[PDB]
Amino acid sequence: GSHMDALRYHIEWNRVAEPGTARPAGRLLAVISPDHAGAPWVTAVLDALGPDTVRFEAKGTDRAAWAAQLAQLREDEGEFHAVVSLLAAAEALHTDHGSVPLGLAQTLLLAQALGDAGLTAPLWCLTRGGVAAGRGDVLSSPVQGALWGLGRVIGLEHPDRWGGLIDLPETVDTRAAARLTGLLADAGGEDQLAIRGSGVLARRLAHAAPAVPGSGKRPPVHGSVLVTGGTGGIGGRVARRLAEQGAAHLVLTSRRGADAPGAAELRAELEQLGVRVTIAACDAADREALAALLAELPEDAPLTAVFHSAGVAHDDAPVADLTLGQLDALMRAKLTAARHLHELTADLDLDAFVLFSSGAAVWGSGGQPGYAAANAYLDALAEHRRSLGLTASSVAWGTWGEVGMATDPEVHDRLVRQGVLAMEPEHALGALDQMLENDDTAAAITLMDWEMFAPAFTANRPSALLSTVPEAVSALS
Amino acid sequence: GSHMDALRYHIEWNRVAEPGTARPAGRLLAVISPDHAGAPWVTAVLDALGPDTVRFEAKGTDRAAWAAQLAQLREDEGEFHAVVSLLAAAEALHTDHGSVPLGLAQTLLLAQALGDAGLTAPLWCLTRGGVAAGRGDVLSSPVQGALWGLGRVIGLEHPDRWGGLIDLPETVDTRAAARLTGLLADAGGEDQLAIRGSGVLARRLAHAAPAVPGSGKRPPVHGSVLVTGGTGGIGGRVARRLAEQGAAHLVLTSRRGADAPGAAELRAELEQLGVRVTIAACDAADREALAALLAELPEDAPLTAVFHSAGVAHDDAPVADLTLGQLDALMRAKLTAARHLHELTADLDLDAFVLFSSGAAVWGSGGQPGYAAANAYLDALAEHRRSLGLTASSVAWGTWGEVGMATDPEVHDRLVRQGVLAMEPEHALGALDQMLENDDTAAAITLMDWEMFAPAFTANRPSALLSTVPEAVSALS
Ligand SMILES: NC(=O)C1=CN([C@@H]2O[C@H](COP(=O)(O)OP(=O)(O)OC[C@H]3O[C@@H](n4cnc5c(N)ncnc54)[C@H](OP(=O)(O)O)[C@@H]3O)[C@@H](O)[C@H]2O)C=CC1
Ligand SMILES: NC(=O)C1=CN([C@@H]2O[C@H](COP(=O)(O)OP(=O)(O)OC[C@H]3O[C@@H](n4cnc5c(N)ncnc54)[C@H](OP(=O)(O)O)[C@@H]3O)[C@@H](O)[C@H]2O)C=CC1
Numbered sequence: 010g011s012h013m014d015a016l017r018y019h020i021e022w023n024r025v026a027e028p029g030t031a032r033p034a035g036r037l038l039a040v041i042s043p044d045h046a047g048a049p050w051v052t053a054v055l056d057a058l059g060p061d062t063v064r065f066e067a068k069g070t071d072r073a074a075w076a077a078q079l080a081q082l083r084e085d086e087g088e089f090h091a092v093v094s095l096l097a098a099a100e101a102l103h104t105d106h107g108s109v110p111l112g113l114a115q116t117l118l119l120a121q122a123l124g125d126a127g128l129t130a131p132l133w134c135l136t137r138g139g140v141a142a143g144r145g146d147v148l149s150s151p152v153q154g155a156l157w158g159l160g161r162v163i164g165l166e167h168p169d170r171w172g173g174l175i176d177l178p179e180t181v182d183t184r185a186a187a188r189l190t191g192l193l194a195d196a197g198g199e200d201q202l203a204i205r206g207s208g209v210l211a212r213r214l215a216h217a218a219p220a221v222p223g224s225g226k227r228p229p230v231h232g233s234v235l236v237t238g239g240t241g242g243i244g245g246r247v248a249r250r251l252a253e254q255g256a257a258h259l260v261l262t263s264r265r266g267a268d269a270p271g272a273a274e275l276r277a278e279l280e281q282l283g284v285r286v287t288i289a290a291c292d293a294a295d296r297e298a299l300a301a302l303l304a305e306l307p308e309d310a311p312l313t314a315v316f317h318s319a320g321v322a323h324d325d326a327p328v329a330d331l332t333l334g335q336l337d338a339l340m341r342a343k344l345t346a347a348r349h350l351h352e353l354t355a356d357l358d359l360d361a362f363v364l365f366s367s368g369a370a371v372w373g374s375g376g377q378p379g380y381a382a383a384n385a386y387l388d389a390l391a392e393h394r395r396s397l398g399l400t401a402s403s404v405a406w407g408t409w410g411e412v413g414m415a416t417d418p419e420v421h422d423r424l425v426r427q428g429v430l431a432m433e434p435e436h437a438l439g440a441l442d443q444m445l446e447n448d449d450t451a452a453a454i455t456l457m458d459w460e461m462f463a464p465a466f467t468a469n470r471p472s473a474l475l476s477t478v479p480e481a482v483s484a485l486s
Numbered sequence: 487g488s489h490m491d492a493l494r495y496h497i498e499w500n501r502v503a504e505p506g507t508a509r510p511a512g513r514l515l516a517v518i519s520p521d522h523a524g525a526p527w528v529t530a531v532l533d534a535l536g537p538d539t540v541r542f543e544a545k546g547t548d549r550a551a552w553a554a555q556l557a558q559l560r561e562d563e564g565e566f567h568a569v570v571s572l573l574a575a576a577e578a579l580h581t582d583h584g585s586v587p588l589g590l591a592q593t594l595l596l597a598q599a600l601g602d603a604g605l606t607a608p609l610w611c612l613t614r615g616g617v618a619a620g621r622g623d624v625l626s627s628p629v630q631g632a633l634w635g636l637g638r639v640i641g642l643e644h645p646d647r648w649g650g651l652i653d654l655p656e657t658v659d660t661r662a663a664a665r666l667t668g669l670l671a672d673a674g675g676e677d678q679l680a681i682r683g684s685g686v687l688a689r690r691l692a693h694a695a696p697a698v699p700g701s702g703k704r705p706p707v708h709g710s711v712l713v714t715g716g717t718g719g720i721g722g723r724v725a726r727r728l729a730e731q732g733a734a735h736l737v738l739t740s741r742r743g744a745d746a747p748g749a750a751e752l753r754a755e756l757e758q759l760g761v762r763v764t765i766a767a768c769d770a771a772d773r774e775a776l777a778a779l780l781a782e783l784p785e786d787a788p789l790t791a792v793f794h795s796a797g798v799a800h801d802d803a804p805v806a807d808l809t810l811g812q813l814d815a816l817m818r819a820k821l822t823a824a825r826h827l828h829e830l831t832a833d834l835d836l837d838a839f840v841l842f843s844s845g846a847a848v849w850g851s852g853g854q855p856g857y858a859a860a861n862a863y864l865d866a867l868a869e870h871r872r873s874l875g876l877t878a879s880s881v882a883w884g885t886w887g888e889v890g891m892a893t894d895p896e897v898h899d900r901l902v903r904q905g906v907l908a909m910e911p912e913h914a915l916g917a918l919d920q921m922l923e924n925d926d927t928a929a930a931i932t933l934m935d936w937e938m939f940a941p942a943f944t945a946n947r948p949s950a951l952l953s954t955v956p957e958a959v960s961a962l963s
């Protein structure tokens with residue numbers, strides 16, 4: 010029990026100091042998405058930054074054009090104190106890349122083009138409702154949430170020219186304005202912040218509360234349960250667990266379906282346990298196929314739970330290199346699939362709606378910006394669903410042993426050297442069960458060697474995020 | 487900052503497993519204080535334990551009489567599963583020992599007499615409002631809180647016949663009753679518990695969160711500040727610090743007053759810093775002298791803060807030996823003095839009301855039951871005051887270097903061997919300033935060698951209290 014407790018961490022938000030009252034001495038550069046600069050918070054922030062602030066309208070998604078334009082701006086206007094991006098407001102999906110929110114595409118390209126141009130002023134990315142900071146806070150935009158996953162990775166890959174992320178409240182009044190312009194003057198080493206009516210909060214990682222035997226909350230597993238990526242490594246083990254725990258009917262999907270490696274053996278394993286098994290070949294981002302799958306479910310085994318395990322991590326790239334095509338392919342199974350699952354089951358009163366995220370989204374991982382963004386959407390969607398009165402749980406895995414992506418010895422070796430150790434499947438699944446029995450909204454379930462991880466993580470830049478993990482503080486002291 | 491952060495720990499409460507639904511198999515022995523058995527919670531608990539439970543009425547405070555009565559009960563009634571003491575309900579002060587709550591005296595004598603008689607069943611001590619467990623919880627009886635200090639020391643000295651402490655909610659309904667009788671059946675290795683509407687909570691020690699720079703909310707030090715025991719080791723250094731921070735007037739008390747060792751030198755030191763100095767000889771348990779002291783404060787320098795450093799630790803004794811006279815003498819400067827300070831200043835809108843407690847109260851110290859009880863009252867009074875809308879901060883010191891009680895080489899050497907290391911005064915006082923800038927209600931400020939402390943503390947019996955200190959868990963693995 011306590012060994013599985015030790016795997017579970019959550020994100021919390023702690024109150025930090027009120028900022029100072031002077032605006033930055035040097036000039037700001039504000040970056041605006043010209044089709045998506047009407048939102049009240051975008052107006053309010055532009056007003057806060059004041060008329061001396063240089064505006065750059067980021068048109069389209071043209072890296073080379075922006076790099077040239079930013080190079081000219083630097084030449085003409087000189088050096089800036091910071092760059093303040095309002096690109097998050099662009100939530101609409103990119104015309105050519107249907108799983109990529111325009112504001113996410115534009116933020117990637119902005120980070121690239123700033124590098125290209127030699128504009129080194131720290132980049133701050135603003136969002137409105139991209140995080141749930143505080144008890145009772147509503148995460149109203151899970152699309153903007155995805156941007157925090159990307160931003161953390163820009164912090165790891167370009168630490169010297171990264172400012173951070175700030176979430177604005179719903180009403181940016183003079184108190185909020187002053188807190189923003191104060192933070193831009195000096196943020197006291199914080200870089201993941203939320204401005205709220207009550208003050209400024211910052212993001213923290215903490216050990217989760219221990220599991221409570223007799224916890225209640227979780228209904229018995231029964232009826233039909235959909236596992237996307239259910240023929241995959243983690244998905245297969247999850248299916249077996251659900252079969253052990255009394256599911257009537259497991260519906261496993263993946264793009265290869267019944268032709269997936271080892272699907273025949275998985276079906277036999279599950280059917281031995283007395284469970285009906287359906288394996289469908291089905292892109293999780295295909296809305297029509299999902300609708301058709303749901304319409305077919307037995308009347309005596311209604312859908313009770315979704316476990317969304319569909320995902321790829323390959324053909325990512327460093328922030329400086331990543332293409333929008335690569336980004337799209339990483340977002341597809343995550344953002345587009347999870348949005349379809351959310352919309353199509355919202356009326357079904359599920360017992361569980363479980364999304365498989367990653368540490369890459371929770372703390373960040375160099376070389377994995379597209380995977381981080383994709384998985385950070387899932388974490389955000391879960392909070393968002395809770396605000397609607399719907400069940401959701403996002404489980405941000407560390408590293409799995411035995412099955413799944415991380416079983417390549419080269420990947421495994423890199424992960425161990427960063428101190429994210431491989432979990433035994435029974436311990437990982439037991440920790441997940443603890444999470445679902447608590448009915449927690451979001452958790453990271455990971456085996457950390459903090460003595461390896463904290464120094465690696467903070468080599469080039471401090472992390473306020475880890476200040477609430479005593480082992481991390483000890484390792485760094 | 488981070489060195490002072492490292493000194494600070496907090497008591498928190500985590501939800502634990504729900505117990506089983508069956509009564510203990512064997513018979514219970516309930517111990518009641520016959521003049522103080524009318525409180526609703528005492529009725530509710532008696533009703534919960536059921537009519538098969540043997541009742542023992544603990545009359546007076548006669549160790550030998552009780553030992554003989556318990557010896558006869560054992561002979562006649564046979565062996566018990568546990569002994570459940572309701573003696574805490576007796577809050578009135580002992581007629582012969584004016585600083586000792588009757589229930590505290592009776593609980594000591596019960597623990598003694600059970601040992602005398604050979605009645606070995608684990609002893610559980612129940613309280614109602616003696617701890618503040620959970621957000622928003624009201625510690626309504628700081629007198630009953632004192633019993634927790636004693637109980638932890640009974641756990642250390644008589645580990646094989648100590649059950650633990652359980653705090654009941656204000657309304658002991660059927661759900662609370664079942665949690666009580668379940669814990670008495672089997673408590674899963676827990677022994678400091680609080681039963682609340684939301685579940686069963688257990689007591690934990692944890693690192694405090696690192697201070698957030700720039701974020702203080704402590705008002706300026708100004709006016710008159712009363713330091714009881716202000717001529718003593720810690721108290722003198724505290725006085726100097728308060729002078730540096732802007733106090734207009736330091737009022738230092740102790741029983742010897744101006745005849746205290748070094749008092750002339752301390753007065754001159756403070757006068758150099760530009761403050762008015764009053765050194766008064768008086769017992770801090772003397773209500774009338776405190777009143778007279780407060781009445782004569784300059785009109786230009788009203789009382790703004792109390793720092794309660796008055797205390798003695800000598801002429802304590804093991805639980806098996808401690809007399810009520812010894813207990814009284816250890817309680818006097820803590821319970822009686824702090825009650826007078828609380829009552830006489832409650833209407834003065836103080837900025838600070840700081841009570842100097844001890845690790846001996848927070849985790850417990852073999853050989854120090856009376857000192858532990860006395861200091862545990864202070865920690866409880868602080869919570870209690872907060873529930874009334876009054877300021878309070880209890881700081882449970884570990885070991886001070888350089889000045890004060892622990893500078894006796896023999897005491898110093900014992901403490902180091904237990905892993906409670908001597909703090910430098912500037913680091914201790916700096917950690918106290920962090921606490922007051924956070925406006926925390928209670929904290930322990932201590933330098934621990936956990937590799938020495940954890941094994942010593944747990945040699946005879948596990949401590950769920952330490953399960954939240956990662957260094958302690960590591961030392962024991
Ligand atoms: N392994 C680990 O340590 C960690 C895993 N995770 C997450 O856990 C989940 C499972 O990972 P894991 O089991 O290790 O990896 P696997 O590759 O073994 O499983 C991924 C599954 O998703 C399927 N899939 C991928 N794209 C799609 C899509 N568009 N539509 C439907 N199915 C798709 C794959 O099958 P097909 O190719 O046939 O579509 C495969 O069955 C992933 O979402 C991953 O991001 C996160 C953190 C760490
Ligand atoms: N030193 C340490 O490491 C720790 C200290 N503490 C607490 O800190 C406080 C200060 O300890 P420290 O400075 O080391 O010890 P000291 O003995 O140096 O100081 C204690 C002071 O309290 C005074 N005092 C004792 N009884 C009374 C009373 N009835 N009325 C008024 N004053 C009285 C003493 O003077 P007089 O005898 O003249 O009255 C003395 O000035 C104590 O309360 C102690 O319990 C707790 C944890 C550890």
Ligand SMILES: CCC(=O)[C@@H](C)C(=O)SCCNC(=O)CCNC(=O)[C@H](O)C(C)(C)CO
Pocket residue numbers: 165322367368369373374375376377407408414415420424427429462465466467468
């Ligand atoms: C392939 C299976 C899988 O999901 C893999 C990619 C993962 O689990 S990726 C996440 C593993 N690594 C991380 O989470 C650690 C990221 N942090 C690290 O400590 C890195 O060393 C730093 C220095 C920050 C540079 O990125």
Ligand SMILES: CCC(=O)[C@@H](C)C(=O)SCCNC(=O)CCNC(=O)[C@H](O)C(C)(C)CO
Pocket residue numbers: 642799844845846850851852853854884885891892897901904906939942943944945
């Ligand atoms: C005299 C000045 C003073 O306040 C001194 C006595 C103190 O600091 S007392 C508290 C010092 N010691 C402790 O707090 C550790 C007590 N715990 C210990 O670890 C003991 O070895 C055990 C094994 C539990 C038996 O009591």
